[PDB]
Amino acid sequence: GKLSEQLKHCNGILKELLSKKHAAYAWPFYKPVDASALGVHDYHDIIKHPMDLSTVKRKMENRDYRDAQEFAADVRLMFSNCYKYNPPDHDVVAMARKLQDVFEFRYAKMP
Ligand SMILES: C=CC[C@@H](C(=O)OC(C)(C)C)[C@@H]1N=C(c2ccc(Cl)cc2)c2cc(OC)ccc2-n2c(C)nnc21
Ligand SMILES: C[C@H](O)COC[C@H](C)O
Ligand SMILES: [Cl-]
Numbered sequence: 001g002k003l004s005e006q007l008k009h010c011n012g013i014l015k016e017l018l019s020k021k022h023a024a025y026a027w028p029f030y031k032p033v034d035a036s037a038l039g040v041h042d043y044h045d046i047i048k049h050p051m052d053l054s055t056v057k058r059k060m061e062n063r064d065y066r067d068a069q070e071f072a073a074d075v076r077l078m079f080s081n082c083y084k085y086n087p088p089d090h091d092v093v094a095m096a097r098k099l100q101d102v103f104e105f106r107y108a109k110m111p
Pocket of ligand 2: 097100101104105
């Protein structure tokens, strides 16, 4: 079935977040955190609800989101996990802030 008009706008935002023009700051958010691979053995004790853009994309393809609010809560959860785990001066936090600016300004243009 066809996404609602608001969910079409959300899918457009998601495609933009995954696109080459934002890759320089978006790439850490592309796939789930692999805590063992990165050596962050406390990650799952601190972050109880992991989220990333590939998971948001699978949920949109599977029609899991029933409205725009549910989609936005997942994208914001992904940024909040980054702000919770890392110190505020970390390089990856600066990248999160820049991608979140892209997201919030386009989300605000919702039909
Ligand atoms: C989860 C690990 C904490 C954080 C970190 O210190 O990672 C390292 C690898 C130990 C430096 C890590 N930094 C990064 C990170 C650190 C510096 C720069 Cl310039 C870019 C991303 C990170 C890297 C990844 O590579 C596949 C995946 C997820 C990353 N991420 C996210 C999302 N949130 N925090 C991070
Ligand atoms: C940088 C804050 O964590 C998120 O700011 C969003 C604003 C639209 O730039
Ligand atoms: Cl929210």
